[model samples]
Target: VQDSWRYRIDWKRLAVAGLSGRWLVVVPEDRSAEAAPVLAALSGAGADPVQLDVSPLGDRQRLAATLGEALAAAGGAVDGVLSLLAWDESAHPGHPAPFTRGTGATLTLVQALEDAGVAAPLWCVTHGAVSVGRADHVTSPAQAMVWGMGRVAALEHPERWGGLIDLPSDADRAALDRMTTVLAGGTGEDQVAVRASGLLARRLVRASLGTASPWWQADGTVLVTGAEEPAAAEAARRLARDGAGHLLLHTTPSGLAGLVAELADLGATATVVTCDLTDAEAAARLLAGVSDAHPLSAVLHLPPTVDSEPLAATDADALARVVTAKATAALHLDRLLREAARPPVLVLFSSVAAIWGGAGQGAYAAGTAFLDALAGQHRADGPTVTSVAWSPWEGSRVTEGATGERLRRLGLRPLAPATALTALDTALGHGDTAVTIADVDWSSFAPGFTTARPGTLLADLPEARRALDE
Candidate 1:
């Protein structure tokens, strides 16, 4: 209630978030707001938590300086890092995880933790906008990306990673105490959400057979955004097979004749509208057009953003564009139709980058991560929102680039269009918030995956281990 620095720590609920022992906490502004409370809570819980600056947003090198010093001070025996940040929304743009201040700063802090090699365990703490897979109350699409980051990090770096905790926007003393305790103690599940309900639990199904009831009938208009060249054929084919009234496509002004030709050749009933999705006014026009065209039955968002720069090199503009194309646009679409009597089934075209954080897709991954999170947040409100984190389509942008080569080195092949369409139909039946559809040579894929990251999430998979054995 006082200044950010002058926080009162409640000792009783300190164990809730595992906040105890030697910890390195990160924050965007007023470290005291996030770090001070954690440090004080650690002290109250009987552990001498170390106070270290995790640095400002977007500057990993600056973070290295401070974090390296912290490592040196400990002589390298820190228990774990408490990667917590209270994002200053006004200071950051409205975009996805890789583009915004909270996530941008958080990622740098994580690099600091990894680069310094001081933490033996870790936990990610962020507040609001993620626990609900598809329908989040007041959470931003960007805010939800943090939740997706935690899951991917857990899968990619299970050794140092402990868990993810989401704090409610309205945290009482009891909730604060619980968060600190868990940060100090240990993470519960691969990811955990703290609410009046205690903890939100989740698990991922590696593969599944498709279900059938969520199938769309042929009478209503289906909205497909960025449904152009690269993924156009497949997106069209899926809709064609299910049968629908009209296909409303949205994208930046580009090759329209080709898209129209492509749809015509397939003999599908779909139409295209061109505009820059990042333009709010333009986006408004597109939605109005879709709603008036017909009763919106389903949504398939495939807007592609291709800033394939390493996370360390991505600048603000790139992050904004990348996020705006995916996350920001999705937010606009969702809110516009929020009060719909029957909110359409929303299927967001995400990517593996969100789930795994590809080497050169820092901004891209951040944007799609919002889709992954939105699917979770969306389902809670109503409507089926499926965010599919697809592997590259055989000759698509990500797969044909140098980045694709790297993925290939890991034995990941682009998903065959035909195969992916088949999976899409099956998963559509289940109405999941998120799913990954990719083709991989597991035996060849396991080694690179294991060596590339220090995570036990996938290593524990019997199939992955078998690949290692061979």
Candidate 2:
């Protein structure tokens, strides 16, 4: 479980000792059975584990007061906490669409802890059948989403909260062997814990690409979604140079003429299709439009999302708009591509925001995480699927904001256009299933990402190793 962890906080000692200390476990009624093993593990360590309901994020005022009353009833003074909350696209937070359950639950739970002045170690745990190298997808989207929020929590508040832990769906056996060490020690590798097996832990990395997938042939159609200005320009330049016989660019109907002109200006011969990407019917039409054409060799997705808003302030409409544009669009493209003579080289763009989540980008992170996990889920079946979880483009409006400025202050400059395309070319050629792109100055980016109880992913990064020395 501790393979690459440097143990920056010596959490194991702290956790093991805390066994006799006080703990808080706020779990939903439906999930209490899952929480049982965690509670039992705490007790086994001689820790006093207090329980609370994962009440619907109803009545903000009452959420705090109810927890306050419960803490008081538990004799007060909480040392650490574990809120076993997960996300549900099908479930709403007693509220709006883009339908979310995880981020809302986080605010209610973490805010309650903060308002209560419980400033010890806190861990938010989840469950998914994932090892570092692969995922079973025994349904882990919600779990992946909660993991995203925990990364945000690490950036937002590291002191009171610990990192996320992924328990086995069969909690008791998983917890019996793994809970003690994590409770005693786990810190933010990425402010999240991914289980390898019954006890082994996992973290993220940007390893080299895999070489087994097919390459985009010259006679093939390179289908790019979200063919908007600035974002789609690079794709046009790079793909057109590949000697491809056909390039079909798809975007929402509203941007039709403008995008067409933009592609022409770039000397692109690509056919632009205007359609609402989220609508499955539109996707089908797009598919039929290109059906009689040459083979679809590669799909490069570059849908842009509106930048940050505090999770508390973000609602369903905003979240749905972004998810549909990027992630949901990827799903539609994937289905359409199946009709191709061979599994096409499908590249779904992702973001570092998903890997190392920050404040005001919960929805963005959740959506990108969905792309990442979604890519993994589809890899085995066919099509050379990959999700490039990229860092910001160098000159985009996204990097012009305050947070972008801060990232700029560090070493995250946008990759030069040619450089960015080169990496895309390399990934496609190698048929990598998932990858992250960034030229991060770890020393510069580390301090911002690494807060109280750092996530372990950095430990596996080369510069993260350098940051330790500095």
Candidate 3:
């Protein structure tokens, strides 16, 4: 009877049911043919395609307004919106795919829909460039663009979307399969989803926790920054569940209030310390207080950020404020804890922007780059400082605006916060010094690291000493 109930709705039938409604596909004028397969696939799976020409708009705002008007005029809702556009160097004159004005427009449309409380799964399809045996002809600009888009979307709308899909070549498929199996065995997940489900590969190696066990049972203090935000609160709650004492810190009184409420529900012994770490002296005093109160073993620094503005147009003061909030806070925190008995393992948050340059991300990139460098310096000083150059964690302020949808149109993968945090945990356990945590192909790192021009390595010399000391 159970089998009959389960089998009554066949997979084909389910696909048809899921696809029966009209799907509005926003496609670029240039790649109508490239988008054909996706449309055919959708139809074959049972969806009725409604193609919309998105090539008319020159910029993101105009395009978003146009799409929003069209959608509103058509009716109240759409079953789904498939943004099919090829964004490579060839597609755009100067801008690349995924980070161009066109892609940003599509993202703005998605944001408009969400702002209007519309619930429709938006799917983005990118040609597989990461799969093995594929020609390396795919441009770096294209890959970086797609990666940025995926990270943004994963950060913004983690709940509504499934993730990015990468089409791997035959040979690459076999290699990925092997890597996936290895990673699944280690992480305990069926498959390691990369770039927000855009790419999947077999795991090459299982991550090891070494001396640290998977579960924490001790009562040592754990420092959780930005405890007011949902992600930070969730992270703090998770830590508490793991049986670690928590020291929740935030800049605002409201955040402190929220942290107290969250802690009250858990009924755990978690202390809330409120301070604006912008003031160096005040920050030092706060750190001294924290040290005197509890034995902090781990520090999770998740700072807040203002909205993203193009580096060219950004105000120096505003940019400085952002740096203070994001990267500078971590630096000050490190200074405060330098002399502490147990030098805490510092986890600094960085973005893929620091590694892969993006449009309108100059300030963010600069701050993240600083953190990346700071992590290296701290690691050199002896503490286990893990600078997680992460893609977007699904449901972050950075993803809350129209910018996120733009990223998705560019082939960005929006990942769940839980998944990102889990990956961070995995990284803390086994990640090497200055590791980049991304959800894309392992090959992505190769170009960024190995393929780049080699620099001089000064070994056991005065130059080396100056480099290290400086």
Candidate 4:
């Protein structure tokens, strides 16, 4: 579902933690030159800095073995862990569609740490992976994906969760000092941005909108991918109702008849195209054809919903299967749009999994996180990009019966179709690039989400404050 509120990072009082003990400083092998000074500072602060090199992020078994062996060598007395893997840009060069080096490596580290049974809190460091304010711009969309997965890591493995820290593009001594402080512990804040001005903590606040300007025009043609999905159909129907003249529905051949008939019922003029969205060449051809016929006014890409499978049970192949279609298609679309003289308004559908962390959504979360990152990176590029991280929908196959009840108890109730659509409209009208629209019941959710630790992320919300206070 959608909301009037959006997340923003605001200034907060800095709570520095005590720097002590033998901390495992995980550095990307390629970025060792960059980590030297940071390691020196950790050592200077009386904290033991043990440098661990991580590279070739593909093999999970070998990576786990390395971490497991390190733990054993250290006599199992690790104090904390700092990951600089986000600085690694060298993913599998030729075939790097499904996952970026930073994202894939971070996933490997999380899985390896779990297998190693290490209890040290793990902190991920990224540079320019977020927009703290107008001055700060996201230089690394790939690194931003780590923040998405890191949030999930916090929820799924709170006992060893250290949090996410974004450093300035030109990180100075002050930034390093602040990083050291937070890494030492007791900050309570997990999501932070260390800028030249001061430290800013991430918060979900109520968004204020000016006059609502419609992003879509009456005669504009909108392209809806994954049209077979209920969410896609809902979006297409809304667009048609709101005066969109023509619609392009892209999906597999099997669902063509049903989807076409359903849209025709609304008296909408649509061209149904069956194409493999996962294939980059095929997707490009499809987009080219659309632009040739009628330049797209907007493109709504809604990935088909999948079941949440546990990270522990998922391997590289399994994870790749989940991300390939969504992540790859998004990358291709972003590139094509960038080349366009006037790019269409790109609206991507992400999931709450990327924000709050689902029980078994490592792969899914990473995939959607890519979309959120893409939207944020391209906010100033051209297209009015809006990536909506939606909550589960009411009556969807994914949230039904026991599953729905479980989510409800955790403070996440699925939104009705109407409620979700309204939120989407608000988000688009406000020109939000990356926003999370979910039906959150803080009273029930806060307690559950923060059962293992403090709910620092939600501490700023008034409802959360009242709910948590009681």
Candidate 5:
């Protein structure tokens, strides 16, 4: 078990006085029954639980106000508030029903609490129906929407909010209990709620490798170019375990020993090729050497990046150093591998900043955007190529320092590498031509802008971007 968290005297006093000892549980009216088990779990933890039916509210604002009123009526201040069931409805504001589109309201309550300058731990539970699909294949929009909400809460009310729970079912209660226990204890977890944190981490790790189920077999060869990071190594082990051949290429021997050890454990053959891929001639030579070793079926390109100053601050040479490492190297590898006897499926690493646009990250984003565009061009020719525009991964170097801070400021979530990996597997398994894996969110490609006028800015953009952006 982890260390116990210390509590504030005010909260302890409130608990003792029983004035604000209540824990509020908010859910859509339709999911009132689904909240029972979680409620039972909370009751068992020695806290008084209050259930609020938010279905009556017309919007998130009214629902938040009603929730505030309910909390005020129950007690002036509650110890913690948990919103379960109906987190997804917040994202789709156009939904006909009032409460269905009132997700923004719940977000408002957390913000209002912050505005009042009062701090109380707030936690949320996202049901499996909303987190992941059930046997019926009904996708849960809640997973992504609540995930975004939790990030917003973290950025807005960092001191108060505890964490988020992606509750797939009653069985996930154990994890929820662990997370809530941490939150109620008053130790500050990251902006991503504890539950959501674990889920994101697990997803990143799990997805990077493909599928975790032992029964599932991984066929063909998976080529990982520039596999030096811990996440990449872990992914190699996962793919190997599922019966896939792994070829790891890198210039440095920094993390090779650990990767070899992991591959041994997974019973997968590991071939370490050390060469400077930036030297196109040397890179091509290396590929030619390995051509007969394995018939390449899929390519997972995770090229390394050298950080430079922002585009405005850095010289062309500095910017080119970073681009050549990540994007150009990938393009060279694609060309070499595509020429091989059996052309492979290519997965290129891109950055979310390229698609979303970020300050001080123009160079990195531009390089990633190039990779994305290259993937499309390659796919048009013949083989399947996917460019994954990933956001800041929790365990990646890109998430360190100012990049991490900027993500928080923008209320963006850092995806676990495993989650990105899983989404990659889903795309590859389903044989998608091209896709973007940004923070575990898979965005499909849309044709053109819908509202483009004949010769205006709207005319130049694709219809899908116009509809979504406008």
Candidate 6:
């Protein structure tokens, strides 16, 4: 019954507070000037500020060495680390590569901070990385990816994790003060935004299904990418039931007959296309050819099913391998679709891991973050997109066997396939750019989440409040 309630991310204003401590301020090479105000703000609060520029530090070794040297020089008693690296959008906003300078550097910083035995919480600052409301816009998806990676970092290393803060482009004195107050660590608010209006903190609030018609067109063909996944397979059937006419199933060569037969039973024709999305040219040509023939009215872009490993044990190669599997294909597909006569209803399948972070899902989070950000980026331009960040599905490959038990224990009960599909309808009906759907038992979840440190983001939830108060 609790799982039936819908949820949305809201930013509520916060009151200002103060703290004084030794602050380690890190900024990207190009954005040194932007760090001045923050440094001054820390100093104004009667805190010691140690600045580290990230441009000179090319690799993890140098980054760690430089960071370690700074820590040593500062007497190794730093209270917290503030990073302005997200302000640097060195990589193209539309770049498919997930591990760019901003995100990768943050990852490196997290690793080095842990290795250096630094227990101080690390907070990342970004501008235009998210949309607070209708008035605000997400200008930098590259920076947004950091927000996703940061969530994972927070989960993976809660002891040393501070939080993610998004500031207005031209941060005012009040906004800076709000940031300082958050830095004080008393408010317990982590994911926050500072605007001229007031201080806004991220909260997951229950949402009611909106009163809007379904976006999928019953007249034209709908494309379902990554059809191999069980959830995607289920979604295809659900779409047909919901009124989509022709179903174009995107998958590898084998298992097509089974899935097509399943869809056929519903009295819907399924077109199976066996093209590797990783192959850029081949994928582009195939996507173009299909859409030209079928005139796609919708596309359900499902993520690839991949196992996650610990970030500490994972290399860049491994990270890229998982990230590109989804992002690369998505990039090509979206690019081609942009030039279409009429845009299709684009539904991207993300995960809750991207929003709140996961223990061993750095790359997965980053890729989904890209999808979420892309949804925001393309809201007005091409497709009426809705990126659903789902919780683990009931009886799916990801939530089966040993992993299922662990997730259930952690308060994340598997979302029934029918319920998940319904949530998708609600999200599309509401015309949301991005949303998260999960079945969480706050009683079992809140304690573990706040064990290492307080999860202020969940502080706004009535369930979390009840779970914590007792």
Instruction: Give the Å error, residue 50, model 5.
Output: 71
Candidate 4 C-alpha lDDT tens digits along 1-470? 24433443344645433588888888877777888888887887678888988784557777778888888988987888899887876655544474667666777888888888888889999987777655556777767778876787777787888899999876877788778877866566789888876667877665544578788765667889888877778888888777777889888546467656666677667888887777778878887886454677888888777655666666655565567655777777777777665557888888878766766777788778777767666345566667888888887876776887888888787778877887888878877777777777777877777776665766777777777742
| lDDT of prediction 6 | 0.75
What is the lDDT for 158 in model 4? 73
Positional deviation of 216 in candidate 5, in angstroms? 13
Q: Answer with 2 or 3, whichever has the higher TM-score.
A: 2
Per-candidate clash tally: 33, 17, 22, 0, 22, 0
Residue range 1-470, candidate 6, lDDT tens digits: 53354677788877644666678888888778777888888888777887888872366677778788888887886899998776665653334454466766676777777777678989998877777887887767667777887887777777788998888865677778778877887776789887887778888777655377657777678888878777788989998777676888888545378878877777678888877876777767666665445577888888677777777777545655676775667766666677553678878888887777778888788777777777766344576667788888887776775877888888888888888888787778777778888888888887867676566667778887777752
lDDT of each: 0.61, 0.62, 0.49, 0.75, 0.50, 0.75
Question: Which whole-number lDDT from 0 to 100 does residue 255 have in model 1?
Answer: 32
TM per candidate comes to: 0.76, 0.82, 0.47, 0.90, 0.47, 0.89
What candidate 6 gets wrong by more than 4 Å, as runs, is 1-5, 16-21, 30-33, 92-98, 169-174, 252-254, 278-280, 291-294
- What does candidate 3's lDDT look like per residue over 210-253, in tens digits? 45343222455677777767768777777765566555455444
TM-score of 6: 0.89
Write the residue-wise lDDT of candidate 5 on 116-201 in tens digits: 43356666655432222112111332233333334334433445756655454334666656545544553322222223224321
lDDT of 3: 0.49
lDDT string, candidate 1, 294-394, tens digits:
76788777776565665445545565666666677777666666644356787888887776554566667767877776665534455667777777788
Q: Which ten contiguous residues of candidate 1 have the minimum total lDDT?
A: 1-10
What lDDT score is found at residue 274 in candidate 5?
A: 76
Evaluate model 2: give its lDDT: 0.62
Better of 1 and 2 by TM-score: 2
